[PDB]
Design a binder for this molecule. Sequence first.
Ligand SMILES: *SCCON[C@@H](C(=O)O)c1c[nH]c2ccccc12
Length: 114
Amino acid sequence: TKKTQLQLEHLLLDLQMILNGINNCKNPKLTRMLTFKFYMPKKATELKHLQCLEEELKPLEEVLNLALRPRDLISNINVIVLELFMCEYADETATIVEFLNRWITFCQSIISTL
Ligand SMILES: *SCCON[C@@H](C(=O)O)c1c[nH]c2ccccc12
């Protein structure tokens, strides 16, 4: 359980650092990046639901590469998810910002239980 918490936390910082680098951009730039839509998960309250994130990693990276990072934090996160059930996506897509916040919440919400 100890190692889990530490992986989740590392996943947490990874996502927050991406969001931090994002929310620090110039507006016009952030504006374009905010045009790209990400698929959100229907449910997401158990570790098993990290499957939705893993599938959205290549896209995330793809949107990011157009713009931290070189390309290590995405791989940091992937490794975590691959180390930490049909994945169903929600109707309406979202912004890279809302995509991070949604998983940051998820991480914090799992850390709250253990
Ligand atoms: S967080 C905003 C920084 O992103 N980079 C933009 C830029 O270099 O001006 C930029 C340009 N094209 C894209 C495409 C997708 C995301 C950001 C982009």
